[PDB]
mmCIF file of N, CA and C and ligand atoms in Angstrom:
data_model
loop_
_atom_site.group_PDB
_atom_site.id
_atom_site.type_symbol
_atom_site.label_atom_id
_atom_site.label_comp_id
_atom_site.label_asym_id
_atom_site.label_seq_id
_atom_site.Cartn_x
_atom_site.Cartn_y
_atom_site.Cartn_z
ATOM 1 N N UNK A 1 11.097 -27.196 -0.351
ATOM 2 C CA UNK A 1 10.012 -26.426 0.342
ATOM 3 C C UNK A 1 10.508 -25.004 0.621
ATOM 4 N N UNK A 2 9.659 -24.170 1.227
ATOM 5 C CA UNK A 2 10.022 -22.780 1.550
ATOM 6 C C UNK A 2 9.531 -22.344 2.923
ATOM 7 N N UNK A 3 10.338 -21.546 3.607
ATOM 8 C CA UNK A 3 9.974 -21.020 4.914
ATOM 9 C C UNK A 3 10.120 -19.500 4.810
ATOM 10 N N UNK A 4 9.055 -18.760 5.103
ATOM 11 C CA UNK A 4 9.116 -17.300 5.049
ATOM 12 C C UNK A 4 8.889 -16.788 6.471
ATOM 13 N N UNK A 5 9.751 -15.891 6.938
ATOM 14 C CA UNK A 5 9.637 -15.401 8.313
ATOM 15 C C UNK A 5 10.089 -13.957 8.472
ATOM 16 N N UNK A 6 9.686 -13.355 9.593
ATOM 17 C CA UNK A 6 10.113 -12.010 9.986
ATOM 18 C C UNK A 6 10.663 -12.202 11.409
ATOM 19 N N UNK A 7 11.824 -11.615 11.694
ATOM 20 C CA UNK A 7 12.436 -11.721 13.014
ATOM 21 C C UNK A 7 13.079 -10.380 13.390
ATOM 22 N N UNK A 8 12.791 -9.896 14.592
ATOM 23 C CA UNK A 8 13.348 -8.626 15.027
ATOM 24 C C UNK A 8 14.678 -8.722 15.739
ATOM 25 N N UNK A 9 14.927 -9.828 16.431
ATOM 26 C CA UNK A 9 16.189 -9.999 17.153
ATOM 27 C C UNK A 9 16.874 -11.330 16.813
ATOM 28 N N UNK A 10 16.210 -12.149 16.005
ATOM 29 C CA UNK A 10 16.790 -13.419 15.610
ATOM 30 C C UNK A 10 16.147 -14.643 16.226
ATOM 31 N N UNK A 11 15.155 -14.466 17.096
ATOM 32 C CA UNK A 11 14.543 -15.635 17.720
ATOM 33 C C UNK A 11 13.739 -16.482 16.744
ATOM 34 N N UNK A 12 12.868 -15.831 15.972
ATOM 35 C CA UNK A 12 12.054 -16.525 14.975
ATOM 36 C C UNK A 12 12.956 -17.032 13.837
ATOM 37 N N UNK A 13 14.027 -16.294 13.552
ATOM 38 C CA UNK A 13 14.986 -16.694 12.518
ATOM 39 C C UNK A 13 15.638 -18.029 12.910
ATOM 40 N N UNK A 14 16.020 -18.141 14.179
ATOM 41 C CA UNK A 14 16.625 -19.363 14.704
ATOM 42 C C UNK A 14 15.604 -20.505 14.586
ATOM 43 N N UNK A 15 14.337 -20.241 14.912
ATOM 44 C CA UNK A 15 13.299 -21.273 14.783
ATOM 45 C C UNK A 15 13.209 -21.725 13.319
ATOM 46 N N UNK A 16 13.260 -20.768 12.400
ATOM 47 C CA UNK A 16 13.176 -21.063 10.970
ATOM 48 C C UNK A 16 14.300 -22.003 10.529
ATOM 49 N N UNK A 17 15.516 -21.713 10.984
ATOM 50 C CA UNK A 17 16.703 -22.511 10.677
ATOM 51 C C UNK A 17 16.557 -23.936 11.177
ATOM 52 N N UNK A 18 16.011 -24.074 12.379
ATOM 53 C CA UNK A 18 15.793 -25.376 12.997
ATOM 54 C C UNK A 18 14.678 -26.153 12.316
ATOM 55 N N UNK A 19 13.611 -25.465 11.932
ATOM 56 C CA UNK A 19 12.507 -26.119 11.237
ATOM 57 C C UNK A 19 13.074 -26.635 9.899
ATOM 58 N N UNK A 20 13.910 -25.819 9.269
ATOM 59 C CA UNK A 20 14.536 -26.179 8.003
ATOM 60 C C UNK A 20 15.417 -27.416 8.192
ATOM 61 N N UNK A 21 16.151 -27.454 9.305
ATOM 62 C CA UNK A 21 17.030 -28.577 9.643
ATOM 63 C C UNK A 21 16.207 -29.881 9.739
ATOM 64 N N UNK A 22 15.016 -29.800 10.346
ATOM 65 C CA UNK A 22 14.141 -30.953 10.481
ATOM 66 C C UNK A 22 13.656 -31.472 9.133
ATOM 67 N N UNK A 23 13.303 -30.547 8.249
ATOM 68 C CA UNK A 23 12.839 -30.904 6.917
ATOM 69 C C UNK A 23 13.976 -31.584 6.138
ATOM 70 N N UNK A 24 15.168 -31.004 6.213
ATOM 71 C CA UNK A 24 16.328 -31.552 5.523
ATOM 72 C C UNK A 24 16.721 -32.923 6.088
ATOM 73 N N UNK A 25 16.721 -33.071 7.414
ATOM 74 C CA UNK A 25 17.060 -34.360 8.019
ATOM 75 C C UNK A 25 16.105 -35.427 7.506
ATOM 76 N N UNK A 26 14.872 -35.016 7.194
ATOM 77 C CA UNK A 26 13.872 -35.934 6.673
ATOM 78 C C UNK A 26 14.146 -36.311 5.214
ATOM 79 N N UNK A 27 15.175 -35.703 4.630
ATOM 80 C CA UNK A 27 15.575 -35.991 3.259
ATOM 81 C C UNK A 27 15.119 -35.059 2.153
ATOM 82 N N UNK A 28 14.526 -33.925 2.512
ATOM 83 C CA UNK A 28 14.022 -32.967 1.526
ATOM 84 C C UNK A 28 14.767 -31.640 1.591
ATOM 85 N N UNK A 29 14.684 -30.840 0.528
ATOM 86 C CA UNK A 29 15.346 -29.533 0.507
ATOM 87 C C UNK A 29 14.350 -28.471 0.961
ATOM 88 N N UNK A 30 14.873 -27.354 1.443
ATOM 89 C CA UNK A 30 14.018 -26.266 1.896
ATOM 90 C C UNK A 30 14.806 -24.970 1.875
ATOM 91 N N UNK A 31 14.147 -23.889 1.458
ATOM 92 C CA UNK A 31 14.788 -22.579 1.400
ATOM 93 C C UNK A 31 14.195 -21.659 2.461
ATOM 94 N N UNK A 32 15.064 -21.046 3.251
ATOM 95 C CA UNK A 32 14.642 -20.121 4.290
ATOM 96 C C UNK A 32 14.718 -18.712 3.700
ATOM 97 N N UNK A 33 13.586 -18.015 3.709
ATOM 98 C CA UNK A 33 13.470 -16.679 3.129
ATOM 99 C C UNK A 33 12.964 -15.633 4.121
ATOM 100 N N UNK A 34 13.721 -14.557 4.283
ATOM 101 C CA UNK A 34 13.283 -13.478 5.150
ATOM 102 C C UNK A 34 12.125 -12.819 4.378
ATOM 103 N N UNK A 35 11.080 -12.392 5.079
ATOM 104 C CA UNK A 35 9.924 -11.797 4.417
ATOM 105 C C UNK A 35 10.261 -10.630 3.486
ATOM 106 N N UNK A 36 11.290 -9.863 3.826
ATOM 107 C CA UNK A 36 11.678 -8.726 3.005
ATOM 108 C C UNK A 36 12.196 -9.119 1.604
ATOM 109 N N UNK A 37 12.691 -10.353 1.463
ATOM 110 C CA UNK A 37 13.232 -10.859 0.194
ATOM 111 C C UNK A 37 12.316 -11.848 -0.532
ATOM 112 N N UNK A 38 11.124 -12.083 -0.001
ATOM 113 C CA UNK A 38 10.212 -13.055 -0.597
ATOM 114 C C UNK A 38 9.602 -12.668 -1.950
ATOM 115 N N UNK A 39 9.433 -13.665 -2.812
ATOM 116 C CA UNK A 39 8.790 -13.441 -4.095
ATOM 117 C C UNK A 39 7.477 -14.190 -3.975
ATOM 118 N N UNK A 40 6.388 -13.439 -3.969
ATOM 119 C CA UNK A 40 5.048 -13.988 -3.819
ATOM 120 C C UNK A 40 4.688 -15.045 -4.854
ATOM 121 N N UNK A 41 4.978 -14.771 -6.120
ATOM 122 C CA UNK A 41 4.639 -15.718 -7.170
ATOM 123 C C UNK A 41 5.345 -17.055 -7.012
ATOM 124 N N UNK A 42 6.597 -17.015 -6.583
ATOM 125 C CA UNK A 42 7.353 -18.239 -6.380
ATOM 126 C C UNK A 42 6.854 -18.951 -5.130
ATOM 127 N N UNK A 43 6.464 -18.170 -4.133
ATOM 128 C CA UNK A 43 5.967 -18.726 -2.888
ATOM 129 C C UNK A 43 4.635 -19.457 -3.074
ATOM 130 N N UNK A 44 3.732 -18.861 -3.844
ATOM 131 C CA UNK A 44 2.410 -19.438 -4.086
ATOM 132 C C UNK A 44 2.371 -20.753 -4.874
ATOM 133 N N UNK A 45 3.516 -21.148 -5.416
ATOM 134 C CA UNK A 45 3.619 -22.392 -6.178
ATOM 135 C C UNK A 45 3.812 -23.596 -5.244
ATOM 136 N N UNK A 46 4.233 -23.306 -4.016
ATOM 137 C CA UNK A 46 4.506 -24.321 -3.003
ATOM 138 C C UNK A 46 3.296 -25.085 -2.494
ATOM 139 N N UNK A 47 3.490 -26.365 -2.209
ATOM 140 C CA UNK A 47 2.404 -27.173 -1.692
ATOM 141 C C UNK A 47 2.066 -26.758 -0.258
ATOM 142 N N UNK A 48 3.083 -26.367 0.505
ATOM 143 C CA UNK A 48 2.894 -25.941 1.891
ATOM 144 C C UNK A 48 3.622 -24.625 2.158
ATOM 145 N N UNK A 49 2.896 -23.657 2.713
ATOM 146 C CA UNK A 49 3.470 -22.358 3.055
ATOM 147 C C UNK A 49 3.833 -22.425 4.542
ATOM 148 N N UNK A 50 5.115 -22.275 4.872
ATOM 149 C CA UNK A 50 5.557 -22.329 6.270
ATOM 150 C C UNK A 50 5.875 -20.883 6.628
ATOM 151 N N UNK A 51 5.042 -20.286 7.468
ATOM 152 C CA UNK A 51 5.170 -18.876 7.813
ATOM 153 C C UNK A 51 5.434 -18.582 9.289
ATOM 154 N N UNK A 52 6.403 -17.708 9.563
ATOM 155 C CA UNK A 52 6.726 -17.381 10.937
ATOM 156 C C UNK A 52 6.898 -15.904 11.219
ATOM 157 N N UNK A 53 6.524 -15.497 12.428
ATOM 158 C CA UNK A 53 6.643 -14.098 12.845
ATOM 159 C C UNK A 53 6.420 -14.019 14.334
ATOM 160 N N UNK A 54 7.273 -13.266 15.002
ATOM 161 C CA UNK A 54 7.179 -13.085 16.437
ATOM 162 C C UNK A 54 5.993 -12.203 16.824
ATOM 163 N N UNK A 55 5.654 -12.211 18.111
ATOM 164 C CA UNK A 55 4.554 -11.400 18.618
ATOM 165 C C UNK A 55 5.027 -9.948 18.669
ATOM 166 N N UNK A 56 4.234 -9.038 18.112
ATOM 167 C CA UNK A 56 4.594 -7.622 18.091
ATOM 168 C C UNK A 56 3.585 -6.716 18.788
ATOM 169 N N UNK A 57 4.073 -5.546 19.198
ATOM 170 C CA UNK A 57 3.309 -4.522 19.903
ATOM 171 C C UNK A 57 2.457 -5.178 20.983
ATOM 172 N N UNK A 58 1.181 -5.401 20.702
ATOM 173 C CA UNK A 58 0.310 -6.055 21.664
ATOM 174 C C UNK A 58 -0.405 -7.214 21.007
ATOM 175 N N UNK A 59 0.296 -8.339 20.949
ATOM 176 C CA UNK A 59 -0.233 -9.572 20.389
ATOM 177 C C UNK A 59 -0.722 -9.492 18.941
ATOM 178 N N UNK A 60 0.078 -8.904 18.057
ATOM 179 C CA UNK A 60 -0.295 -8.830 16.641
ATOM 180 C C UNK A 60 0.912 -9.218 15.805
ATOM 181 N N UNK A 61 0.709 -9.372 14.502
ATOM 182 C CA UNK A 61 1.799 -9.712 13.590
ATOM 183 C C UNK A 61 2.601 -8.430 13.373
ATOM 184 N N UNK A 62 3.884 -8.557 13.047
ATOM 185 C CA UNK A 62 4.724 -7.379 12.803
ATOM 186 C C UNK A 62 4.044 -6.535 11.720
ATOM 187 N N UNK A 63 3.930 -5.236 11.978
ATOM 188 C CA UNK A 63 3.205 -4.321 11.103
ATOM 189 C C UNK A 63 3.809 -3.754 9.822
ATOM 190 N N UNK A 64 5.108 -3.486 9.809
ATOM 191 C CA UNK A 64 5.727 -2.893 8.627
ATOM 192 C C UNK A 64 6.039 -3.815 7.454
ATOM 193 N N UNK A 65 6.252 -5.100 7.728
ATOM 194 C CA UNK A 65 6.606 -6.040 6.668
ATOM 195 C C UNK A 65 5.782 -7.310 6.589
ATOM 196 N N UNK A 66 5.673 -8.021 7.701
ATOM 197 C CA UNK A 66 4.938 -9.266 7.701
ATOM 198 C C UNK A 66 3.439 -9.104 7.429
ATOM 199 N N UNK A 67 2.794 -8.211 8.172
ATOM 200 C CA UNK A 67 1.365 -7.946 8.017
ATOM 201 C C UNK A 67 1.008 -7.672 6.549
ATOM 202 N N UNK A 68 1.701 -6.724 5.896
ATOM 203 C CA UNK A 68 1.423 -6.413 4.486
ATOM 204 C C UNK A 68 1.577 -7.647 3.589
ATOM 205 N N UNK A 69 2.599 -8.451 3.867
ATOM 206 C CA UNK A 69 2.842 -9.683 3.124
ATOM 207 C C UNK A 69 1.626 -10.624 3.248
ATOM 208 N N UNK A 70 1.129 -10.809 4.469
ATOM 209 C CA UNK A 70 -0.025 -11.681 4.683
ATOM 210 C C UNK A 70 -1.241 -11.137 3.932
ATOM 211 N N UNK A 71 -1.430 -9.822 3.988
ATOM 212 C CA UNK A 71 -2.543 -9.176 3.296
ATOM 213 C C UNK A 71 -2.468 -9.417 1.795
ATOM 214 N N UNK A 72 -1.275 -9.300 1.232
ATOM 215 C CA UNK A 72 -1.119 -9.477 -0.202
ATOM 216 C C UNK A 72 -1.400 -10.893 -0.702
ATOM 217 N N UNK A 73 -0.999 -11.907 0.059
ATOM 218 C CA UNK A 73 -1.255 -13.287 -0.354
ATOM 219 C C UNK A 73 -2.631 -13.807 0.076
ATOM 220 N N UNK A 74 -3.282 -13.104 1.002
ATOM 221 C CA UNK A 74 -4.575 -13.512 1.542
ATOM 222 C C UNK A 74 -5.656 -13.958 0.562
ATOM 223 N N UNK A 75 -5.736 -13.336 -0.608
ATOM 224 C CA UNK A 75 -6.773 -13.708 -1.571
ATOM 225 C C UNK A 75 -6.378 -14.798 -2.569
ATOM 226 N N UNK A 76 -5.121 -15.228 -2.518
ATOM 227 C CA UNK A 76 -4.603 -16.229 -3.449
ATOM 228 C C UNK A 76 -4.129 -17.501 -2.761
ATOM 229 N N UNK A 77 -4.669 -17.819 -1.591
ATOM 230 C CA UNK A 77 -4.205 -19.003 -0.862
ATOM 231 C C UNK A 77 -5.309 -19.909 -0.353
ATOM 232 N N UNK A 78 -6.508 -19.753 -0.904
ATOM 233 C CA UNK A 78 -7.631 -20.581 -0.493
ATOM 234 C C UNK A 78 -7.341 -22.049 -0.847
ATOM 235 N N UNK A 79 -7.541 -22.940 0.115
ATOM 236 C CA UNK A 79 -7.303 -24.355 -0.097
ATOM 237 C C UNK A 79 -5.853 -24.778 0.098
ATOM 238 N N UNK A 80 -4.958 -23.808 0.281
ATOM 239 C CA UNK A 80 -3.540 -24.116 0.464
ATOM 240 C C UNK A 80 -3.191 -24.547 1.879
ATOM 241 N N UNK A 81 -2.218 -25.445 1.984
ATOM 242 C CA UNK A 81 -1.758 -25.928 3.275
ATOM 243 C C UNK A 81 -0.739 -24.916 3.789
ATOM 244 N N UNK A 82 -0.825 -24.607 5.076
ATOM 245 C CA UNK A 82 0.084 -23.663 5.718
ATOM 246 C C UNK A 82 0.438 -24.182 7.106
ATOM 247 N N UNK A 83 1.659 -23.899 7.546
ATOM 248 C CA UNK A 83 2.137 -24.288 8.877
ATOM 249 C C UNK A 83 2.646 -22.969 9.449
ATOM 250 N N UNK A 84 2.241 -22.639 10.672
ATOM 251 C CA UNK A 84 2.602 -21.363 11.296
ATOM 252 C C UNK A 84 3.499 -21.513 12.522
ATOM 253 N N UNK A 85 4.380 -20.528 12.746
ATOM 254 C CA UNK A 85 5.295 -20.535 13.897
ATOM 255 C C UNK A 85 5.762 -19.143 14.288
ATOM 256 N N UNK A 86 6.430 -19.056 15.434
ATOM 257 C CA UNK A 86 6.951 -17.780 15.881
ATOM 258 C C UNK A 86 7.352 -17.776 17.342
ATOM 259 N N UNK A 87 8.220 -16.832 17.683
ATOM 260 C CA UNK A 87 8.715 -16.652 19.040
ATOM 261 C C UNK A 87 7.907 -15.521 19.703
ATOM 262 N N UNK A 88 7.771 -15.591 21.022
ATOM 263 C CA UNK A 88 7.030 -14.585 21.775
ATOM 264 C C UNK A 88 7.756 -14.357 23.097
ATOM 265 N N UNK A 89 7.364 -13.314 23.821
ATOM 266 C CA UNK A 89 8.067 -12.997 25.047
ATOM 267 C C UNK A 89 7.384 -13.056 26.393
ATOM 268 N N UNK A 90 6.244 -12.398 26.532
ATOM 269 C CA UNK A 90 5.554 -12.376 27.822
ATOM 270 C C UNK A 90 4.121 -12.869 27.804
ATOM 271 N N UNK A 91 3.571 -13.063 26.615
ATOM 272 C CA UNK A 91 2.206 -13.527 26.511
ATOM 273 C C UNK A 91 2.137 -15.038 26.535
ATOM 274 N N UNK A 92 1.011 -15.583 26.095
ATOM 275 C CA UNK A 92 0.846 -17.030 26.046
ATOM 276 C C UNK A 92 0.367 -17.521 24.678
ATOM 277 N N UNK A 93 0.641 -16.738 23.640
ATOM 278 C CA UNK A 93 0.274 -17.142 22.297
ATOM 279 C C UNK A 93 -0.925 -16.495 21.644
ATOM 280 N N UNK A 94 -1.443 -15.396 22.192
ATOM 281 C CA UNK A 94 -2.614 -14.760 21.579
ATOM 282 C C UNK A 94 -2.413 -14.358 20.123
ATOM 283 N N UNK A 95 -1.269 -13.772 19.790
ATOM 284 C CA UNK A 95 -1.036 -13.359 18.406
ATOM 285 C C UNK A 95 -1.106 -14.560 17.460
ATOM 286 N N UNK A 96 -0.646 -15.717 17.929
ATOM 287 C CA UNK A 96 -0.646 -16.933 17.116
ATOM 288 C C UNK A 96 -2.047 -17.549 16.966
ATOM 289 N N UNK A 97 -2.844 -17.469 18.028
ATOM 290 C CA UNK A 97 -4.211 -17.960 17.990
ATOM 291 C C UNK A 97 -4.924 -17.137 16.910
ATOM 292 N N UNK A 98 -4.721 -15.827 16.928
ATOM 293 C CA UNK A 98 -5.337 -14.943 15.938
ATOM 294 C C UNK A 98 -4.816 -15.202 14.519
ATOM 295 N N UNK A 99 -3.506 -15.411 14.389
ATOM 296 C CA UNK A 99 -2.864 -15.690 13.100
ATOM 297 C C UNK A 99 -3.486 -16.965 12.501
ATOM 298 N N UNK A 100 -3.671 -17.987 13.335
ATOM 299 C CA UNK A 100 -4.264 -19.234 12.871
ATOM 300 C C UNK A 100 -5.712 -19.018 12.407
ATOM 301 N N UNK A 101 -6.492 -18.289 13.199
ATOM 302 C CA UNK A 101 -7.882 -18.029 12.837
ATOM 303 C C UNK A 101 -7.929 -17.271 11.512
ATOM 304 N N UNK A 102 -7.025 -16.314 11.367
ATOM 305 C CA UNK A 102 -6.935 -15.483 10.175
ATOM 306 C C UNK A 102 -6.703 -16.304 8.902
ATOM 307 N N UNK A 103 -5.688 -17.159 8.935
ATOM 308 C CA UNK A 103 -5.345 -17.988 7.789
ATOM 309 C C UNK A 103 -6.485 -18.928 7.441
ATOM 310 N N UNK A 104 -7.157 -19.422 8.470
ATOM 311 C CA UNK A 104 -8.287 -20.305 8.277
ATOM 312 C C UNK A 104 -9.394 -19.531 7.575
ATOM 313 N N UNK A 105 -9.600 -18.283 7.994
ATOM 314 C CA UNK A 105 -10.619 -17.436 7.390
ATOM 315 C C UNK A 105 -10.336 -17.121 5.929
ATOM 316 N N UNK A 106 -9.083 -17.279 5.510
ATOM 317 C CA UNK A 106 -8.706 -17.043 4.117
ATOM 318 C C UNK A 106 -8.909 -18.325 3.316
ATOM 319 N N UNK A 107 -9.328 -19.389 3.988
ATOM 320 C CA UNK A 107 -9.544 -20.660 3.311
ATOM 321 C C UNK A 107 -8.356 -21.614 3.365
ATOM 322 N N UNK A 108 -7.326 -21.270 4.132
ATOM 323 C CA UNK A 108 -6.145 -22.121 4.251
ATOM 324 C C UNK A 108 -6.388 -23.301 5.169
ATOM 325 N N UNK A 109 -5.650 -24.378 4.933
ATOM 326 C CA UNK A 109 -5.758 -25.550 5.780
ATOM 327 C C UNK A 109 -4.511 -25.513 6.664
ATOM 328 N N UNK A 110 -4.692 -25.217 7.945
ATOM 329 C CA UNK A 110 -3.568 -25.171 8.891
ATOM 330 C C UNK A 110 -3.252 -26.635 9.247
ATOM 331 N N UNK A 111 -2.158 -27.149 8.683
ATOM 332 C CA UNK A 111 -1.765 -28.548 8.848
ATOM 333 C C UNK A 111 -1.334 -29.101 10.209
ATOM 334 N N UNK A 112 -0.694 -28.285 11.034
ATOM 335 C CA UNK A 112 -0.256 -28.741 12.356
ATOM 336 C C UNK A 112 -0.588 -27.650 13.362
ATOM 337 N N UNK A 113 -0.440 -27.961 14.643
ATOM 338 C CA UNK A 113 -0.675 -26.980 15.697
ATOM 339 C C UNK A 113 0.464 -25.974 15.505
ATOM 340 N N UNK A 114 0.160 -24.660 15.505
ATOM 341 C CA UNK A 114 1.236 -23.675 15.326
ATOM 342 C C UNK A 114 2.320 -23.832 16.383
ATOM 343 N N UNK A 115 3.571 -23.694 15.973
ATOM 344 C CA UNK A 115 4.695 -23.811 16.890
ATOM 345 C C UNK A 115 5.083 -22.447 17.476
ATOM 346 N N UNK A 116 4.975 -22.305 18.787
ATOM 347 C CA UNK A 116 5.368 -21.060 19.435
ATOM 348 C C UNK A 116 6.393 -21.404 20.503
ATOM 349 N N UNK A 117 7.446 -20.601 20.569
ATOM 350 C CA UNK A 117 8.550 -20.803 21.507
ATOM 351 C C UNK A 117 8.848 -19.468 22.167
ATOM 352 N N UNK A 118 9.081 -19.487 23.480
ATOM 353 C CA UNK A 118 9.362 -18.254 24.203
ATOM 354 C C UNK A 118 10.830 -17.859 24.083
ATOM 355 N N UNK A 119 11.071 -16.642 23.598
ATOM 356 C CA UNK A 119 12.426 -16.107 23.420
ATOM 357 C C UNK A 119 13.241 -16.998 22.468
ATOM 358 N N UNK A 120 14.561 -17.075 22.647
ATOM 359 C CA UNK A 120 15.368 -17.925 21.767
ATOM 360 C C UNK A 120 15.041 -19.385 22.110
ATOM 361 N N UNK A 121 14.916 -20.260 21.100
ATOM 362 C CA UNK A 121 14.593 -21.676 21.327
ATOM 363 C C UNK A 121 15.247 -22.359 22.542
ATOM 364 N N UNK A 122 16.572 -22.449 22.537
ATOM 365 C CA UNK A 122 17.342 -23.083 23.616
ATOM 366 C C UNK A 122 16.895 -24.524 23.901
ATOM 367 N N UNK A 123 16.162 -24.748 24.997
ATOM 368 C CA UNK A 123 15.683 -26.092 25.340
ATOM 369 C C UNK A 123 14.681 -26.567 24.296
ATOM 370 N N UNK A 124 14.037 -25.617 23.628
ATOM 371 C CA UNK A 124 13.046 -25.947 22.614
ATOM 372 C C UNK A 124 13.632 -26.172 21.227
ATOM 373 N N UNK A 125 14.956 -26.262 21.116
ATOM 374 C CA UNK A 125 15.551 -26.462 19.797
ATOM 375 C C UNK A 125 15.029 -27.724 19.119
ATOM 376 N N UNK A 126 14.972 -28.825 19.858
ATOM 377 C CA UNK A 126 14.478 -30.066 19.265
ATOM 378 C C UNK A 126 13.015 -29.942 18.838
ATOM 379 N N UNK A 127 12.202 -29.214 19.609
ATOM 380 C CA UNK A 127 10.787 -29.031 19.242
ATOM 381 C C UNK A 127 10.681 -28.367 17.863
ATOM 382 N N UNK A 128 11.590 -27.432 17.576
ATOM 383 C CA UNK A 128 11.594 -26.730 16.284
ATOM 384 C C UNK A 128 11.929 -27.722 15.163
ATOM 385 N N UNK A 129 12.963 -28.535 15.387
ATOM 386 C CA UNK A 129 13.381 -29.563 14.428
ATOM 387 C C UNK A 129 12.214 -30.545 14.177
ATOM 388 N N UNK A 130 11.551 -30.987 15.248
ATOM 389 C CA UNK A 130 10.435 -31.927 15.118
ATOM 390 C C UNK A 130 9.246 -31.358 14.341
ATOM 391 N N UNK A 131 8.990 -30.061 14.505
ATOM 392 C CA UNK A 131 7.904 -29.392 13.788
ATOM 393 C C UNK A 131 8.210 -29.506 12.293
ATOM 394 N N UNK A 132 9.470 -29.238 11.931
ATOM 395 C CA UNK A 132 9.913 -29.330 10.549
ATOM 396 C C UNK A 132 9.715 -30.743 10.027
ATOM 397 N N UNK A 133 9.995 -31.739 10.863
ATOM 398 C CA UNK A 133 9.817 -33.138 10.461
ATOM 399 C C UNK A 133 8.343 -33.482 10.222
ATOM 400 N N UNK A 134 7.452 -32.936 11.042
ATOM 401 C CA UNK A 134 6.024 -33.187 10.868
ATOM 402 C C UNK A 134 5.584 -32.649 9.505
ATOM 403 N N UNK A 135 6.010 -31.428 9.192
ATOM 404 C CA UNK A 135 5.667 -30.774 7.932
ATOM 405 C C UNK A 135 6.212 -31.572 6.747
ATOM 406 N N UNK A 136 7.428 -32.093 6.887
ATOM 407 C CA UNK A 136 8.049 -32.886 5.828
ATOM 408 C C UNK A 136 7.325 -34.220 5.630
ATOM 409 N N UNK A 137 6.632 -34.676 6.671
ATOM 410 C CA UNK A 137 5.895 -35.943 6.643
ATOM 411 C C UNK A 137 4.463 -35.795 6.088
ATOM 412 N N UNK A 138 4.149 -34.632 5.530
ATOM 413 C CA UNK A 138 2.815 -34.390 4.986
ATOM 414 C C UNK A 138 2.739 -34.791 3.514
HETATM 415 C C1 FMN S 1 7.839 -3.867 20.389
HETATM 416 C C2 FMN S 1 7.624 -5.282 20.869
HETATM 417 C C3 FMN S 1 6.385 -5.730 21.212
HETATM 418 C C4 FMN S 1 6.164 -7.074 21.607
HETATM 419 N N1 FMN S 1 4.867 -7.554 21.796
HETATM 420 C C5 FMN S 1 4.739 -8.788 22.299
HETATM 421 C C6 FMN S 1 3.423 -9.297 22.711
HETATM 422 O O1 FMN S 1 2.398 -8.628 22.586
HETATM 423 N N2 FMN S 1 3.428 -10.576 23.254
HETATM 424 C C7 FMN S 1 4.560 -11.344 23.531
HETATM 425 O O2 FMN S 1 4.481 -12.397 24.121
HETATM 426 N N3 FMN S 1 5.770 -10.870 23.127
HETATM 427 C C8 FMN S 1 5.882 -9.688 22.561
HETATM 428 N N4 FMN S 1 7.135 -9.205 22.251
HETATM 429 C C9 FMN S 1 8.325 -10.030 22.509
HETATM 430 C C10 FMN S 1 8.874 -10.743 21.267
HETATM 431 O O3 FMN S 1 7.807 -11.435 20.618
HETATM 432 C C11 FMN S 1 9.942 -11.761 21.697
HETATM 433 O O4 FMN S 1 11.051 -11.078 22.287
HETATM 434 C C12 FMN S 1 10.440 -12.712 20.600
HETATM 435 O O5 FMN S 1 11.338 -13.663 21.173
HETATM 436 C C13 FMN S 1 11.143 -11.925 19.494
HETATM 437 O O6 FMN S 1 11.382 -12.746 18.382
HETATM 438 P P1 FMN S 1 12.210 -12.211 17.157
HETATM 439 O O7 FMN S 1 13.623 -11.986 17.496
HETATM 440 O O8 FMN S 1 11.957 -13.209 16.129
HETATM 441 O O9 FMN S 1 11.485 -10.917 16.779
HETATM 442 C C14 FMN S 1 7.318 -7.929 21.732
HETATM 443 C C15 FMN S 1 8.592 -7.445 21.433
HETATM 444 C C16 FMN S 1 8.751 -6.150 20.974
HETATM 445 C C17 FMN S 1 10.133 -5.693 20.557
#
């Protein structure tokens, strides 16, 4: 499988690693890819797109890299399964609620409740691993 994410300080990156750990513990392989190194054509071949990005500016997706990436794949993902995640700091998940609505509007099937964790996982480390296990169980 594949996990594509953007992280500014490493919080979402840590979530990605843990989600990957859950998928692997379930017996499957998974590649963690920073959005800057992603290959769209290779990504679109996947049965499930696992996408992550922290809350930026005022409850939006990161603007310089992640946002453009979502825009580029937006017209080629209708009917595709996607799982969303990300770390946030002071809000309560607005950027993620919007991200979910957005992907749905592109015709994607959001397979699980998006995983959001405040700051670095820490106590939520197991929640990240379990999210990965749910995705692997699809
Ligand atoms: C410029 C900037 C704007 C932010 N905007 C939001 C926001 O609107 N809502 C929120 O809850 N957190 C916001 N945050 C906090 C980050 O989402 C949070 O620190 C998260 O843990 C960072 O994850 P990362 O290391 O993966 O980027 C913002 C952080 C920065 C640097």
